[PDB]
RNA sequence: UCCGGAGAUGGGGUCUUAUGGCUGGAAGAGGCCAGCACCUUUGCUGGCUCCGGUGCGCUUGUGACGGCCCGUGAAAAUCC
């Protein structure tokens, strides 16, 4: 249950120019294969494209400035949970708490007894919560 | 190297007049000649100004296409 916090993407930074999945699409509709639009329709299309561009810019900026605040709040909640678990001193949760602290510590300012192995366990080799 | 049961090939028609042809303007104009007048603005007269070819040529306009980039590629006056 407590291992799901290990999968928080908001507490991860990857390489600034990571390669994503190969996506191929037509860059633009071909000029000779366009649909006829009236002058009023073409002017409306220009206007709505101008609106859409600025909406996209504003949404990008808002998402950027909200991700950091959400990251701060989630960091506070996660660290409070981890520290309260440690103060409670539960013998069956120490390894996960230490692994989470090691993973998300730099974001701040026994396998038989557990079930449902963590997501991407084939690639996420446990740094502190080893078998 | 694209089109055709989303109707090809074939047969018969409709349209835009861009651009060519003939004519009016217009030969009376302009051009090239010859001849005859005068101490002078010193101008009068008569002919011919026609028929063609050629283009990986230069300049320019235009038509149907093809490729690439891209907000379907400035706005308004104005006319229909």
């Amino acid at each position: 249950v407590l291992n799901m916090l290990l999968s928080l993407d908001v507490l991860h930074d990857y390489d600034p120019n990571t390669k994503l999945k190969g996506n191929v699409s037509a860059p633009k509709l071909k000029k000779k294969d366009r649909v006829h639009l009236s002058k009023k329709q073409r002017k409306a299309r220009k206007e709505m494209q101008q609106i859409e561009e600025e909406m996209r810019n504003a949404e990008q900026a808002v998402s950027a400035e909200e991700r950091e605040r959400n990251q701060s709040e989630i960091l506070k909640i996660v660290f409070t949970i981890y520290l309260n678990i440690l103060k409670n001193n539960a013998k069956t949760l120490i390894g996960s708490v230490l692994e989470g602290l090691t993973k998300f510590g730099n974001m701040a300012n026994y396998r038989s007894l557990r079930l449902a192995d963590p997501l991407n366990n084939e690639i996420i080799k446990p740094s502190v919560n080893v078998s």
Side-chain angles (χ1 to χ4, degrees), chain A residues 79-93:
Chain A
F79 284 143
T80 315
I81 288 168
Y82 279 164
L83 288 176
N84 266 26
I85 290 281
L86 273 186
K87 298 296 183 290
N88 199 4
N89 194 56
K91 318 301 293 153
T92 186
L93 298 159

Side-chain angles (χ1 to χ4, degrees), chain A residues 71-121:
Chain A
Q71 183 180 87
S72 168
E73 290 299 276
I74 289 172
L75 276 166
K76 292 182 181 180
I77 289 189
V78 160
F79 284 143
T80 315
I81 288 168
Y82 279 164
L83 288 176
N84 266 26
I85 290 281
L86 273 186
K87 298 296 183 290
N88 199 4
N89 194 56
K91 318 301 293 153
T92 186
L93 298 159
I94 301 299
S96 180
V97 163
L98 277 296
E99 194 184 7
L101 281 190
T102 58
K103 282 183 68 176
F104 310 135
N106 304 269
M107 281 305 98
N109 185 327
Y110 281 102
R111 294 178 68 243
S112 74
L113 192 173
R114 84 183 182 190
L115 73 170
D117 275 347
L119 190 66
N120 266 26
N121 200 6

Side-chain angles (χ1 to χ4, degrees), chain A residues 4-14 67 71 104 107:
Chain A
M4 65 183 73
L5 314 184
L6 278 298
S7 179
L8 277 160
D9 189 313
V10 76
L11 306 183
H12 281 96
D13 313 288
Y14 290 74
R67 173 208 167 78
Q71 183 180 87
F104 310 135
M107 281 305 98

Side-chain angles (χ1 to χ4, degrees), chain A residues 41-86:
Chain A
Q41 295 197 3
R42 296 204 315 263
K43 292 182 156 62
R45 175 187 189 103
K46 265 199 201 183
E47 170 155 70
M48 66 182 180
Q49 285 179 352
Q50 291 177 357
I51 293 171
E52 180 158 339
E53 190 267 331
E54 83 179 348
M55 294 299 291
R56 173 157 34 76
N57 296 346
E59 204 282 346
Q60 280 193 30
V62 166
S63 193
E65 66 182 1
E66 294 294 328
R67 173 208 167 78
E68 197 181 319
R69 193 202 42 103
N70 275 322
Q71 183 180 87
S72 168
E73 290 299 276
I74 289 172
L75 276 166
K76 292 182 181 180
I77 289 189
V78 160
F79 284 143
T80 315
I81 288 168
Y82 279 164
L83 288 176
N84 266 26
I85 290 281
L86 273 186

